[PDB]
Amino acid sequence: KRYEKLDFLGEGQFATVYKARDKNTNQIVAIKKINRTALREIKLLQELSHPNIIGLLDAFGSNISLVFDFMETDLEVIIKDNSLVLTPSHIKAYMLMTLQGLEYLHQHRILHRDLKPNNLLLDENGVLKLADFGLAKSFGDPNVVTRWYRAPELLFGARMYGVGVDMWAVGCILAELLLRVPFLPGDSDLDQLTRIFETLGTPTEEQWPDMCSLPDYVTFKSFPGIPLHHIFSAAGDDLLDLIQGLFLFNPCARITATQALKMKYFSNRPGPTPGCQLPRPN
Ligand SMILES: CC1(C)CC[C@H](Nc2ncc(C(F)(F)F)c(-c3c[nH]c4c(P(C)(C)=O)c(C#N)ccc34)n2)CN1
């Protein structure tokens, strides 16, 4: 075979994943040995080419094997690792790679729909790539991330939706970088809306006009919500406005990947850390 099977990387409800060596270029890779979460990581990734999106390098039959770039670490590992402190500049660099990847996705009319820390992968040189495109779909296709990163429209059972689903998840990732714990850990779908509205305030028909006409909208307790300078007490105003923009309840008011990258936080000092100096676990 083409590959030298090095390590077992893990098992899910799709695939057995493996570290391996490409036996003719000596390049280290990752192989996803596995229908519809499989045929639509190929349909999308052999198409796409962006530094901050995982590359599909080869594939074959009888189980399907899918050969991506090997990444040493991921953002969940960095978050969990106590030896690493995250300076403002490391966070800006993680956010800037994550947003430049999604802005190209959203410009190619694709929703990732599964953004979590553990799908933001990180190669030895500190390039963040988005991975796990098995829940991704085109803006066009007719009709949903893990509960903690899930937008309130989806929790009120919205049937059509867009960019905002991925942008809410990015905000939850930014909060977890800054707080180093999950921002909104709901134990259920209803608890998830309880925590959202207890943290950010129970919205109105002004904050969110068609909210009362969502398929699963239900009258929640009013909560004032905590101000974002209390939760993110070390964050500057430039960063507090990025957060405020990604956590707006109205999905169309909610800031896009392009509007996020046009915010002053990304041109303000301190600019993002070089890839090669981003913190490294062992
Ligand atoms: C704990 C670490 C840091 C160790 C290295 C691993 N490096 C890596 N590089 C590329 C890929 C990719 F994306 F290219 F395959 C993957 C990968 C993607 N989905 C995976 C899964 P699942 C089945 C949860 O989707 C499992 C399981 N089990 C295991 C690995 C992956 N991992 C990332 N995490």
PDB file of all heavy atoms in Angstrom, residues 114-132:
ATOM      1  N   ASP A 114     -20.378  22.658  12.019  1.00  0.00           N
ATOM      2  CA  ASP A 114     -19.884  21.867  13.134  1.00  0.00           C
ATOM      3  C   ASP A 114     -18.662  22.511  13.773  1.00  0.00           C
ATOM      4  O   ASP A 114     -17.796  21.788  14.280  1.00  0.00           O
ATOM      5  CB  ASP A 114     -19.594  20.452  12.630  1.00  0.00           C
ATOM      6  CG  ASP A 114     -19.464  19.369  13.694  1.00  0.00           C
ATOM      7  OD1 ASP A 114     -19.766  19.652  14.869  1.00  0.00           O
ATOM      8  OD2 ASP A 114     -19.049  18.228  13.339  1.00  0.00           O
ATOM      9  N   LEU A 115     -18.580  23.858  13.788  1.00  0.00           N
ATOM     10  CA  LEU A 115     -17.420  24.521  14.351  1.00  0.00           C
ATOM     11  C   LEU A 115     -17.358  24.305  15.855  1.00  0.00           C
ATOM     12  O   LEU A 115     -18.277  24.657  16.604  1.00  0.00           O
ATOM     13  CB  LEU A 115     -17.390  26.003  14.006  1.00  0.00           C
ATOM     14  CG  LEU A 115     -17.135  26.319  12.520  1.00  0.00           C
ATOM     15  CD1 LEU A 115     -17.608  27.670  12.194  1.00  0.00           C
ATOM     16  CD2 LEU A 115     -15.652  26.151  12.156  1.00  0.00           C
ATOM     17  N   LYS A 116     -16.302  23.631  16.286  1.00  0.00           N
ATOM     18  CA  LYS A 116     -16.000  23.500  17.690  1.00  0.00           C
ATOM     19  C   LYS A 116     -14.438  23.653  17.788  1.00  0.00           C
ATOM     20  O   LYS A 116     -13.761  23.614  16.734  1.00  0.00           O
ATOM     21  CB  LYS A 116     -16.591  22.197  18.307  1.00  0.00           C
ATOM     22  CG  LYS A 116     -16.535  20.910  17.456  1.00  0.00           C
ATOM     23  CD  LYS A 116     -17.379  19.846  18.118  1.00  0.00           C
ATOM     24  CE  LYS A 116     -17.197  18.471  17.557  1.00  0.00           C
ATOM     25  NZ  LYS A 116     -17.470  17.366  18.576  1.00  0.00           N
ATOM     26  N   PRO A 117     -13.884  23.879  18.998  1.00  0.00           N
ATOM     27  CA  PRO A 117     -12.432  23.850  19.174  1.00  0.00           C
ATOM     28  C   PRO A 117     -11.731  22.602  18.638  1.00  0.00           C
ATOM     29  O   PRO A 117     -10.635  22.725  18.087  1.00  0.00           O
ATOM     30  CB  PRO A 117     -12.272  23.979  20.698  1.00  0.00           C
ATOM     31  CG  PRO A 117     -13.427  24.790  21.096  1.00  0.00           C
ATOM     32  CD  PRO A 117     -14.545  24.236  20.267  1.00  0.00           C
ATOM     33  N   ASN A 118     -12.322  21.412  18.803  1.00  0.00           N
ATOM     34  CA  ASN A 118     -11.628  20.186  18.425  1.00  0.00           C
ATOM     35  C   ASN A 118     -11.568  19.965  16.873  1.00  0.00           C
ATOM     36  O   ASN A 118     -10.767  19.131  16.432  1.00  0.00           O
ATOM     37  CB  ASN A 118     -12.191  18.995  19.179  1.00  0.00           C
ATOM     38  CG  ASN A 118     -13.531  18.494  18.773  1.00  0.00           C
ATOM     39  OD1 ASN A 118     -14.024  18.755  17.678  1.00  0.00           O
ATOM     40  ND2 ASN A 118     -14.141  17.728  19.666  1.00  0.00           N
ATOM     41  N   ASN A 119     -12.390  20.722  16.066  1.00  0.00           N
ATOM     42  CA  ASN A 119     -12.332  20.769  14.550  1.00  0.00           C
ATOM     43  C   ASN A 119     -11.518  21.945  14.002  1.00  0.00           C
ATOM     44  O   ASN A 119     -11.438  22.125  12.777  1.00  0.00           O
ATOM     45  CB  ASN A 119     -13.708  20.832  13.976  1.00  0.00           C
ATOM     46  CG  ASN A 119     -14.542  19.639  14.269  1.00  0.00           C
ATOM     47  OD1 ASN A 119     -14.073  18.575  14.693  1.00  0.00           O
ATOM     48  ND2 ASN A 119     -15.828  19.793  14.027  1.00  0.00           N
ATOM     49  N   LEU A 120     -10.907  22.741  14.894  1.00  0.00           N
ATOM     50  CA  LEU A 120      -9.897  23.717  14.504  1.00  0.00           C
ATOM     51  C   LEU A 120      -8.614  23.059  14.857  1.00  0.00           C
ATOM     52  O   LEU A 120      -8.227  22.990  16.013  1.00  0.00           O
ATOM     53  CB  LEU A 120     -10.103  25.073  15.207  1.00  0.00           C
ATOM     54  CG  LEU A 120     -11.586  25.542  15.258  1.00  0.00           C
ATOM     55  CD1 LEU A 120     -11.763  26.768  16.097  1.00  0.00           C
ATOM     56  CD2 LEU A 120     -12.122  25.717  13.944  1.00  0.00           C
ATOM     57  N   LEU A 121      -7.975  22.532  13.848  1.00  0.00           N
ATOM     58  CA  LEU A 121      -6.709  21.807  13.895  1.00  0.00           C
ATOM     59  C   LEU A 121      -5.516  22.692  13.583  1.00  0.00           C
ATOM     60  O   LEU A 121      -5.671  23.738  12.959  1.00  0.00           O
ATOM     61  CB  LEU A 121      -6.750  20.670  12.883  1.00  0.00           C
ATOM     62  CG  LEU A 121      -7.986  19.743  12.977  1.00  0.00           C
ATOM     63  CD1 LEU A 121      -7.919  18.707  11.959  1.00  0.00           C
ATOM     64  CD2 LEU A 121      -8.060  19.108  14.390  1.00  0.00           C
ATOM     65  N   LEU A 122      -4.300  22.228  14.006  1.00  0.00           N
ATOM     66  CA  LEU A 122      -3.118  23.054  14.126  1.00  0.00           C
ATOM     67  C   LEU A 122      -1.872  22.246  13.827  1.00  0.00           C
ATOM     68  O   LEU A 122      -1.491  21.391  14.608  1.00  0.00           O
ATOM     69  CB  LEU A 122      -3.076  23.617  15.577  1.00  0.00           C
ATOM     70  CG  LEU A 122      -3.730  25.000  15.782  1.00  0.00           C
ATOM     71  CD1 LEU A 122      -4.662  25.019  16.902  1.00  0.00           C
ATOM     72  CD2 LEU A 122      -2.689  26.034  15.908  1.00  0.00           C
ATOM     73  N   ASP A 123      -1.228  22.516  12.698  1.00  0.00           N
ATOM     74  CA  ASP A 123      -0.042  21.748  12.278  1.00  0.00           C
ATOM     75  C   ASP A 123       1.179  22.273  12.951  1.00  0.00           C
ATOM     76  O   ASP A 123       1.111  23.323  13.552  1.00  0.00           O
ATOM     77  CB  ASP A 123       0.102  21.719  10.724  1.00  0.00           C
ATOM     78  CG  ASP A 123       0.494  23.041  10.084  1.00  0.00           C
ATOM     79  OD1 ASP A 123       1.076  23.915  10.818  1.00  0.00           O
ATOM     80  OD2 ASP A 123       0.239  23.210   8.831  1.00  0.00           O
ATOM     81  N   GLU A 124       2.294  21.572  12.880  1.00  0.00           N
ATOM     82  CA  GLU A 124       3.536  21.950  13.643  1.00  0.00           C
ATOM     83  C   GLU A 124       3.983  23.419  13.491  1.00  0.00           C
ATOM     84  O   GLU A 124       4.607  23.973  14.373  1.00  0.00           O
ATOM     85  CB  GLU A 124       4.718  21.053  13.245  1.00  0.00           C
ATOM     86  CG  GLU A 124       4.858  20.934  11.745  1.00  0.00           C
ATOM     87  CD  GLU A 124       6.246  20.756  11.188  1.00  0.00           C
ATOM     88  OE1 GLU A 124       7.201  20.603  11.989  1.00  0.00           O
ATOM     89  OE2 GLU A 124       6.368  20.776   9.936  1.00  0.00           O
ATOM     90  N   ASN A 125       3.684  24.019  12.373  1.00  0.00           N
ATOM     91  CA  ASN A 125       4.000  25.408  12.081  1.00  0.00           C
ATOM     92  C   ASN A 125       2.956  26.412  12.549  1.00  0.00           C
ATOM     93  O   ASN A 125       3.097  27.600  12.285  1.00  0.00           O
ATOM     94  CB  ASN A 125       4.244  25.535  10.571  1.00  0.00           C
ATOM     95  CG  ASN A 125       5.543  24.889  10.140  1.00  0.00           C
ATOM     96  OD1 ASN A 125       6.311  24.316  10.960  1.00  0.00           O
ATOM     97  ND2 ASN A 125       5.828  24.975   8.840  1.00  0.00           N
ATOM     98  N   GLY A 126       1.924  25.943  13.229  1.00  0.00           N
ATOM     99  CA  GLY A 126       0.889  26.781  13.812  1.00  0.00           C
ATOM    100  C   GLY A 126      -0.040  27.376  12.803  1.00  0.00           C
ATOM    101  O   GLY A 126      -0.433  28.528  12.957  1.00  0.00           O
ATOM    102  N   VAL A 127      -0.392  26.612  11.771  1.00  0.00           N
ATOM    103  CA  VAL A 127      -1.423  27.006  10.821  1.00  0.00           C
ATOM    104  C   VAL A 127      -2.692  26.268  11.265  1.00  0.00           C
ATOM    105  O   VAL A 127      -2.710  25.023  11.389  1.00  0.00           O
ATOM    106  CB  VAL A 127      -1.065  26.680   9.383  1.00  0.00           C
ATOM    107  CG1 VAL A 127      -2.244  27.020   8.445  1.00  0.00           C
ATOM    108  CG2 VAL A 127       0.180  27.420   8.952  1.00  0.00           C
ATOM    109  N   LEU A 128      -3.722  27.041  11.549  1.00  0.00           N
ATOM    110  CA  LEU A 128      -5.002  26.511  11.878  1.00  0.00           C
ATOM    111  C   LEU A 128      -5.776  26.186  10.582  1.00  0.00           C
ATOM    112  O   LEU A 128      -5.827  27.000   9.660  1.00  0.00           O
ATOM    113  CB  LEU A 128      -5.710  27.495  12.816  1.00  0.00           C
ATOM    114  CG  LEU A 128      -7.130  27.238  13.220  1.00  0.00           C
ATOM    115  CD1 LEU A 128      -7.431  28.036  14.487  1.00  0.00           C
ATOM    116  CD2 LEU A 128      -8.125  27.601  12.096  1.00  0.00           C
ATOM    117  N   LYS A 129      -6.339  24.959  10.515  1.00  0.00           N
ATOM    118  CA  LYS A 129      -7.171  24.474   9.451  1.00  0.00           C
ATOM    119  C   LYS A 129      -8.488  23.967  10.015  1.00  0.00           C
ATOM    120  O   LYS A 129      -8.524  23.342  11.088  1.00  0.00           O
ATOM    121  CB  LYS A 129      -6.475  23.361   8.655  1.00  0.00           C
ATOM    122  CG  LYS A 129      -5.093  23.720   8.081  1.00  0.00           C
ATOM    123  CD  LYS A 129      -4.750  22.556   7.106  1.00  0.00           C
ATOM    124  CE  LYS A 129      -3.316  22.235   6.692  1.00  0.00           C
ATOM    125  NZ  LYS A 129      -2.720  23.265   5.805  1.00  0.00           N
ATOM    126  N   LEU A 130      -9.563  24.248   9.313  1.00  0.00           N
ATOM    127  CA  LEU A 130     -10.886  23.734   9.646  1.00  0.00           C
ATOM    128  C   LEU A 130     -10.967  22.342   9.172  1.00  0.00           C
ATOM    129  O   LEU A 130     -10.481  22.055   8.098  1.00  0.00           O
ATOM    130  CB  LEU A 130     -11.998  24.518   8.972  1.00  0.00           C
ATOM    131  CG  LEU A 130     -12.025  26.027   9.289  1.00  0.00           C
ATOM    132  CD1 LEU A 130     -13.119  26.848   8.447  1.00  0.00           C
ATOM    133  CD2 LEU A 130     -12.226  26.233  10.677  1.00  0.00           C
ATOM    134  N   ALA A 131     -11.579  21.473   9.956  1.00  0.00           N
ATOM    135  CA  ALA A 131     -11.718  20.098   9.564  1.00  0.00           C
ATOM    136  C   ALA A 131     -13.123  19.571   9.854  1.00  0.00           C
ATOM    137  O   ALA A 131     -13.988  20.307  10.358  1.00  0.00           O
ATOM    138  CB  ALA A 131     -10.603  19.280  10.200  1.00  0.00           C
ATOM    139  N   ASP A 132     -13.357  18.305   9.464  1.00  0.00           N
ATOM    140  CA  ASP A 132     -14.576  17.580   9.690  1.00  0.00           C
ATOM    141  C   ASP A 132     -15.711  18.264   8.929  1.00  0.00           C
ATOM    142  O   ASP A 132     -16.587  18.898   9.485  1.00  0.00           O
ATOM    143  CB  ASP A 132     -14.782  17.366  11.201  1.00  0.00           C
ATOM    144  CG  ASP A 132     -13.676  16.500  11.823  1.00  0.00           C
ATOM    145  OD1 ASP A 132     -13.294  15.484  11.200  1.00  0.00           O
ATOM    146  OD2 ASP A 132     -13.189  16.847  12.939  1.00  0.00           O
TER     147      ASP A 132
END
